[PDB]
Design a protein around this ligand. Structure first.
Ligand SMILES: NC(=O)c1ccc(F)c(Cl)c1
Length: 209
């Protein structure tokens, strides 16, 4: 049972512009997704301060980076607050319509593309490097769901029958054929050190056989 949704026009426009604009500084996608994971971890930590049972679904607060050269995927896993089905449909818990408008207005006023995260829509920078993005998420108040989009104006949501995650979000980047540098250990390490060196949660870069 798969549900197919249209992106709001403004979000489809932002994704088309991310996909089609010439812009060499693609590595910022990883900073943006790690920052999103850190924000989601902050949220579940705050909730746990007054309700410890919020961590019954998992006490560890961390971020894992999992490259897979056979699948040509880079997966960013966090154990943050996760998203409900309603969150996924509502632009993955973002105010993407007004954020896109502000990002657009800022670019006309002299902001840089790398500033996308200041406008709450840093997630969509994934499409700088990914032809398809799958988001697996589990929120304490809902079931496990899979969101997926190859852009082109639509996304899908289905119940996820795969590996239970407990709580958190898994962003699976199906990389473009010419973007496989982001599967190399030394390249990922360089980007994390350059852009994410002060994130307040452990970031573990997995290695491969
Ligand atoms: N207008 C642009 O060239 C532009 C604006 C925002 C973006 F995220 C990108 Cl990649 C390009």
């Amino acid at each position: 049972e798969v549900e197919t949704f249209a992106f709001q026009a403004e979000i489809a426009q932002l994704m088309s512009l991310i996909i089609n604009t010439f812009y060499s500084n693609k590595e910022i996608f990883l900073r943006e997704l790690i920052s999103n994971s850190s924000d989601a971890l902050d949220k579940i930590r705050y909730e746990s301060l007054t309700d410890p049972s919020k961590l019954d679904s998992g006490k560890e607060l961390h971020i894992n980076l999992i490259p897979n050269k056979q699948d040509r995927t880079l997966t960013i896993v966090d154990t943050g607050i996760g998203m409900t089905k309603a969150d996924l449909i509502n632009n993955l818990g973002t105010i993407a319509k007004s954020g896109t408008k502000a990002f657009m207005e800022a670019l006309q006023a002299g902001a840089d593309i790398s500033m996308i995260g200041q406008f709450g829509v840093g997630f969509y920078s994934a499409y700088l490097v990914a032809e398809k993005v799958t988001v697996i998420t589990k929120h304490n108040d809902d079931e496990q769901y899979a969101w997926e989009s190859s852009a082109g104006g639509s996304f899908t949501v289905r119940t996820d029958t795969g590996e239970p995650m407990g709580r958190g979000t898994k962003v699976i980047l199906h990389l473009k054929e010419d973007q496989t540098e982001y599967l190399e250990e030394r390249r990922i390490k360089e980007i994390v050190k350059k852009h994410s060196q002060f994130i307040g949660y452990p970031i573990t870069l997995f290695v491969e056989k």
